[PDB]
């Protein structure tokens, strides 16, 4: 019965990673946010979630962090957002990396779905025991 919690945590974590990848793709060409700061790319942090003491368990998303990767600089001095040298900070989104993240998250999502289907069938069949 714990397997439902484990696989549901896995599905939630992969959904969060997919949403972060979609957010990175959407704002690859973004210039500014609601304030004057640029869009720093997001990445989720996966951890092992074992509420009891048995070492292993499901995966949990501890936090969403902004990659410390350097900000791309484009020479646009007429933009009011430019600094003293006339450069504007554009995000450092890795397009190929984010597409690969999307596809890999999708595949892991399906694997966890298949696991849930199989174990649900087994737990339905165990109620038949000797009757």
């Amino acid at each position: 019965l714990n397997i439902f919690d484990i696989a549901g945590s896995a599905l939630a974590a992969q959904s969060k990673r997919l949403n972060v990848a979609a957010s990175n793709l959407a704002n690859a060409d973004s210039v500014t946010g609601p304030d004057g700061q640029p869009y720093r790319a997001k990445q989720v942090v996966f951890q092992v979630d074992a509420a009891p003491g048995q070492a292993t368990g499901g995966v949990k998303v501890a936090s969403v962090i902004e990659s410390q990767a350097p900000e791309k600089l484009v020479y646009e001095p007429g933009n009011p957002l430019a600094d003293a040298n006339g450069y504007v900070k554009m995000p450092n989104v890795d397009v190929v990396g984010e597409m690969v993240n999307t596809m890999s998250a999708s595949r892991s999502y399906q694997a966890n779905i298949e696991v849930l289907n199989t174990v649900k069938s087994m737990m339905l069949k165990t109620l038949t025991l000797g009757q």
Binding site: A12, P34, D35, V61
Partner: peptide, 20 residues
């Protein structure tokens, strides 16, 4: 608390402003 736990108090409303 935990992102998927149970609390008795409603989550605060979420709004997305264009500029702050």
């Amino acid at each position: 608390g935990v992102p998927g736990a149970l609390s008795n108090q409603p989550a605060p409303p979420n709004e997305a402003p264009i500029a702050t």
